[PDB]
Symmetry: C3
Subunit: 99 residues, 3 copies
């Protein structure tokens, strides 16, 4: 192809593609939104979300197909755990009593 993309908007935002490094950049915006009636898919080895306030997944179900790692966990309304569950490195308590 021979097309190019470097849109420089009057508010300072930029949308650009650089083919030598194959880098797509969107910068200088306040908000972005995508509204679709079917699906949104991203297929890429690494997804990195740096959100200094919050990431909200407002959905009936979030599915992690393999491992999920978190710093801390808060479960609000119960759940189920199958397989070996290993607690270490502190106290596991239930209704105020240590297990």
């Amino acid at each position: 192809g021979s097309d190019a993309l470097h849109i420089r908007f009057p508010d300072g935002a930029v949308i650009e593609y650089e083919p030598e490094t194959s880098a797509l950049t969107v910068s200088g915006i306040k908000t972005a939104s995508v509204t679709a009636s079917g699906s949104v898919t991203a297929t890429v080895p690494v997804v990195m979300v740096k959100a200094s306030t919050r990431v909200t997944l407002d959905t009936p179900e979030v599915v992690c197909t393999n491992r999920l790692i978190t710093g801390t966990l808060e479960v609000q309304k119960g759940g189920t755990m199958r397989g070996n569950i290993e607690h270490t490195g502190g106290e596991l308590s239930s209704n105020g009593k240590v297990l």
Copy 2:
């Protein structure tokens, strides 16, 4: 260029509105992004409103600090390090209330 505003014959819109600094894609059925390296989003607030499901089909999802959920289902085991406080119900294991 210096502007972006496209209205397609299906009613979709792809635009950038510099007055409010808002990038908008609307009225579409599907979107897909395929990249060989990485996608990064850096922004205070991310909101995904998905009336059916969000699937993270990956070897590992990492939340760097807190994860809050309504309910939890762990299918194939896990490890919990630190102090874990259970309250507000019963803990059952292998068919019996503990």
Copy 3:
């Protein structure tokens, strides 16, 4: 009222009104930097990431159910409500709790 871009490296950005499909393909990286918010509103979101998805934020909120294969909690937490464990051993600090036949 159209969008079909093909770059010298083979990447494409296109919108197809017949199927109402937006496609970005053939790129190496994308980066979006915004000062306010990024929102997606759609029934189904699929992230197919052969290495890893990192949510680097003070808080990830799942409003309803979270399902995972395996779980690792690094620095503690709280669980409220009824929790049902099945199909393996429950242990704390190396001590297998007596929840099945020894």
